[PDB]
Design a protein around this ligand. Structure first.
Ligand SMILES: C[C@H](C(=O)N1CCC[C@H](C(N)=O)C1)c1cncc(F)c1
Ligand SMILES: [Zn+2]
Length: 139
């Protein structure tokens, strides 16, 4: 679990969104596993606007942060689950690192700010849904 709080927005994995998230829906994209809902309290996370491929992510299953090199956002195959059929997930970045069910939502950050959130894993890999292209989060 986990979320990004920026301005009057909350960014979460679409498959983990709550009833409150859907009742205050701003935008969602099943192909990216992202949902953005509106908030009453002001968020103070900063979003990165860059092409970094190195950063640090929070891994809940280890209660630790790990440094990673990660790929450029791209269309990557994701296996079937109770939330989605087998499909290509867009804007996804892979890294070699530990992740297991429960880790979705952990933030990936670089020196510029928040890059994205854990969305996939398995096999000594971890996948992050990028948010750097969502320029409207800042306004
Ligand atoms: C199996 C699971 C996963 O990648 N999912 C399930 C939940 C929906 C995900 C999606 N983006 O469609 C795909 C997982 C395995 N290891 C680490 C994780 F953080 C997660
Ligand atoms: Zn950066």
């Amino acid at each position: 679990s986990g979320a990004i709080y920026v301005g009057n927005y909350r960014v979460v994995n679409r498959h983990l969104a709550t009833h409150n998230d859907w009742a205050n829906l701003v935008w969602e994209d099943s192909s990216r596993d992202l949902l953005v809902s509106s908030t009453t309290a002001q968020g103070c996370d900063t979003i990165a606007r860059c092409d970094c491929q190195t950063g640090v992510y929070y891994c809940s299953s280890r209660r630790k942060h790990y440094p990673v090199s990660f790929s450029k956002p791209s269309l990557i195959f994701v296996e079937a689950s109770e939330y989605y059929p087998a499909r290509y997930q867009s804007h996804l970045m892979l890294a070699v690192g530990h992740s297991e069910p429960g880790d979705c939502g952990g933030i990936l950050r670089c020196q510029h700010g928040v890059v994205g959130i854990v969305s996939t894993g398995g096999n000594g890999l971890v996948g992050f849904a990028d948010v750097r292209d969502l320029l409207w989060l800042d306004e």
